[PDB]
Write a protein that binds this ligand. Structure first.
Ligand code: HEM
Ligand code: HEM
Lengths: 145, 145
């Protein structure tokens, strides 16, 4: 279950998530747009899903993309803040899962964000250990898809 | 105009928003659920829109309501964090406006959350001065609906 996936997150994993978030979560606009542009650059097949945002190649200049990117970072902020209470983490994870289920995003497709997260983390010198920690958090959402 | 509305957030209004947010934003789960249950109690006619959440009268015991409520508080956190830059505040406001436009929520009905905000603020000893500052922030979203 989602609860199982959440209850699994260990103290060391939570520590790595919080430590790396202190940095990448400190510039939500910059890193949020970086995540999205990287997704589109490495997984061009996903561009079609974001047609509401207009021309995503405009990057920061695209107000719809910018608004979406900043908001995406607050979803991550939400997750990070609920780490110590699996019950609360689960209910917010399911809320966002619905936002994606209605758009026909499968668990496998949702996992495509792992690549961009790994690259953004690396840009701030957070290595594989941190990328693996984030993949575990993403997997909690995947358990709901 | 959402831009003219954003211009109404003067230095004093911004300070009052930040000062009161430091308190109500400290318990997102508690105060978020309080806002929603107050909305449903004072404005029964809005309950129909929240069909997906199930039995909202269960309050905190309702997992979907709790997930929704916590997330709503992160939308407010988002707005407060964008007060320094109007172009960024506007793009996040328009993102959430779309979330409501698709739900057929008008500016007038969106404004019904002012009552709940005033009550929740008052319960923490923040009076009309603060309620009015928050009404101006809500007015920015209303301009986009
Ligand atoms: C770290 C992972 C991710 C998080 C935290 C996340 C978060 C969000 C949030 C908060 C929204 C706004 C929901 C709404 O207001 O309706 C959103 C929308 C969306 N997401 Fe994600 N997302 C993630 C990964 C993905 C991936 C990898 C895909 C696709 C392969 C995807 C596809 C979409 C689509 C199509 C939308 C709707 C955009 C729109 O039309 O406004 N998401 N996401
Ligand atoms: C301070 C004011 C408000 C804020 C910041 C706010 C924020 C939010 C957020 C963040 C969501 C989730 C968006 C999504 O994932 O699609 C949401 C959903 C929703 N909001 Fe609001 N909202 C506010 C006031 C209102 C009011 C007063 C109404 C109705 C009279 C309303 C009706 C809705 C509905 C129907 C949903 C969809 C719930 C669902 O099915 O999940 N909102 N709101």
């Amino acid at each position: 279950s989602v609860y199982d996936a959440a209850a699994q997150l260990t103290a060391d994993v939570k520590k790595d998530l919080r430590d790396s978030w202190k940095v990448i979560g400190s510039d939500k606009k910059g890193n949020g747009v970086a995540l999205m542009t990287t997704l589109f650059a490495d997984n061009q097949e996903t561009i079609g899903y974001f047609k509401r945002l207009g021309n995503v190649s405009q990057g920061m200049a695209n107000d719809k993309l910018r608004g979406h990117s900043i908001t995406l970072m607050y979803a991550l902020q939400n997750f990070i803040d609920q780490l110590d209470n699996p019950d609360d983490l689960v209910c917010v994870v399911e809320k966002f899962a619905v936002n994606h289920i209605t758009r026909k995003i499968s668990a496998a497709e949702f996992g495509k964000m792992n690549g961009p997260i790994k690259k953004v983390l690396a840009s701030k010198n957070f290595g594989d250990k941190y990328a693996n920690a984030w993949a575990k958090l993403v997997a909690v959402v995947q358990a709901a898809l």
